[PDB]
């Protein structure tokens, strides 16, 4: 989510700023005091090819491309000096010793890689040589995914000695292996991403963002997630946001009759078609907006 409102002024490590956040269609009193973190993803509770079994989910690739659960991930590089021995600068091959093999010292400018350039594995991001003629105490970018240098500064430490501070940013979309969860505690791993023409669609054109297995419900009894979809389905059409705080009086029988008052079915299920073949299922499918949140467990980091 918006992990901090002053993020651009910070050089933080392993911090993720998700761009788009939504208030739940079924909110609670907890959202009067903290910012909501997530999106009101359309979820279909169906079997679609067996790719959402054993707590996996199927994600729409179009939903990913549009910025769903996308954000920027930040890392930090703080390097310190030895007073009057070490310095920041680009080394030279014909003097300095034990340079790292296969390293790219050519991206440095005055010892620091300039802000805005893409650093890949084996690139030297901070140049540092100790005077013996010289020994190369450099810092090499040892990460698989390339980053972009976001901020470079030379602040003064508690001892009034220079150290180098660098902020590296990563453009993190949702991708296969990333973890998502509902507000009922039903987490899952993105297993398959389908194009917008392969996802199932209803007779009225509605298609899901996530497809979750119906077999995640019966053994876990996360009934608040199914009631949220039923309530939120009529909230969207009525143009309202309601409160679903715990222990407030609810009547699922009356919430279901609320669906029929808005032109839907009692059960909230709709006639859907297979997007790959165009053939309708012989069963109405329960599809509606369920608030889902992206957990900060990135497969690119693990």
């Amino acid at each position: 989510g918006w992990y901090c409102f002053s993020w651009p002024y910070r050089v933080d490590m392993n911090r993720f700023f998700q761009f788009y956040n939504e208030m739940p269609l079924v909110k609670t009193i907890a959202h009067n005091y903290v910012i909501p973190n997530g999106l009101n993803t359309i979820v279909a509770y169906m079997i679609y090819g067996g790719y959402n079994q054993e707590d996996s989910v199927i994600v729409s690739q179009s939903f990913i491309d549009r910025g769903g659960f996308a954000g920027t991930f930040y890392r930090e590089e703080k390097v310190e000096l030895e007073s009057d021995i070490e310095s920041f600068g680009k080394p030279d091959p014909l003097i300095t010793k034990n340079l790292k093999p296969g390293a790219n010292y050519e991206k440095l400018v005055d010892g620091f890689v300039p802000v805005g350039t893409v650093v890949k594995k084996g690139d030297i991001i901070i140049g540092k040589v100790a005077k013996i003629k010289y020994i190369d105490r450099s810092v090499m970018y040892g990460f698989d995914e390339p980053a972009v240098v976001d901020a470079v500064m030379r602040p003064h430490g508690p001892n009034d000695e220079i150290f180098g501070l660098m902020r590296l940013r990563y453009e993190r979309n949702l991708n296969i292996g990333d973890k998502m969860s509902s507000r009922s505690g039903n987490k899952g791993i993105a297993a398959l991403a389908l194009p917008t023409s392969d996802m199932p669609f209803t007779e009225d054109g509605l298609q899901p963002d996530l497809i979750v297995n119906p077999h995640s419900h019966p053994s876990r009894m996360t009934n608040g997630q199914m009631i949220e979809t039923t309530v939120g389905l009529a909230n969207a059409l009525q143009g309202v946001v309601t409160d679903g705080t715990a222990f407030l009086p609810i009547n699922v029988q009356l919430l279901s009759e609320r669906l029929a008052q808005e032109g839907l079915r009692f059960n909230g299920c709709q006639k859907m078609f297979n997007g790959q073949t165009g053939e309708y299922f012989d069963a109405a499918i329960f599809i509606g907006p369920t608030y889902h949140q992206r957990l900060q467990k990135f497969v690119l980091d693990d």
Binding site: R154, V240, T242, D243, P249, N251, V252, L254
Partner: protein
């Protein structure tokens, strides 16, 4: 010179003063690209040359001071809302500068502007409302209180015991034929025999006790 510049360029006060200087055009809207631009921006924002800064012992006395001095006495609530935002911004910067300088009679002005900004934040909170809805009970005119919760009720003791005092054992399933022409009209079976004697031509009507031989729905005919 370099250590002073590095110390001050990382001061949040410096970026705030630079923003105020950019707002009224005293310095270019872009960051310095050359040593001359950086020196000019420092001279304008801090109010002293970096070499001249060492020379003395003051630092906050000559930091930028916004050019337009609007009237903040209309912040007394009195094309106004954008003007209100402008006044809030300028008053906040001016009080920040006053706090840095320990200017006399600051706490009272600070509390006054805190009240002003609380009102302004109330307006912004009004702007930041998505809406809210309550499902009303039609019988009443307020939030629905109808629930499907359990409601305790002392049942008659005849629902557990018969007129001879023995407990009920609902173990005989009674099936009635859906179609009138179907015969026999009723079949009474036990759980192990349902698959052997009942088809879709019959429907489960009621249970029966295996002790007093009464239908469950006719248990209220027992003398309590």
């Amino acid at each position: 010179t370099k250590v002073l510049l590095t110390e001050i360029l990382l001061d949040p006060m410096y970026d705030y003063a630079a923003t105020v200087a950019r707002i009224d055009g005293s310095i270019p809207m872009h960051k310095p690209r050359t040593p001359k631009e950086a020196e000019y921006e420092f001279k304008t924002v801090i109010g002293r040359t970096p070499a001249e800064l060492l020379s003395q012992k003051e630092f906050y006395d000559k930091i930028y001071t916004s050019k337009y001095r609007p009237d903040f006495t209309q912040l007394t609530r009195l094309r106004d809302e954008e003007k209100t935002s402008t006044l809030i911004y300028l008053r906040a910067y001016e009080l920040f500068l006053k706090y840095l300088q320990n200017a006399p009679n600051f706490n009272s002005e600070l509390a006054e502007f805190k009240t002003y900004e609380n009102a302004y934040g109330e307006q912004k909170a009004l702007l930041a409302q998505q809406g809210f809805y309550n499902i009303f009970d039609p019988n009443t005119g307020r939030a629905d209180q109808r629930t499907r919760l359990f409601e305790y009720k002392r049942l008659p003791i005849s629902t557990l015991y018969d007129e001879r005092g023995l407990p009920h054992k609902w173990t005989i399933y009674v099936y009635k034929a859906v179609d009138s022409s179907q015969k026999p009209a009723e079949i009474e079976v036990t759980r192990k025999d349902v698959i052997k004697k009942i088809d879709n031509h019959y429907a489960l009507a009621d249970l029966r006790c295996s002790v007093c031989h009464v239908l469950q729905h006719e248990v209220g005919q027992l003398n309590i």
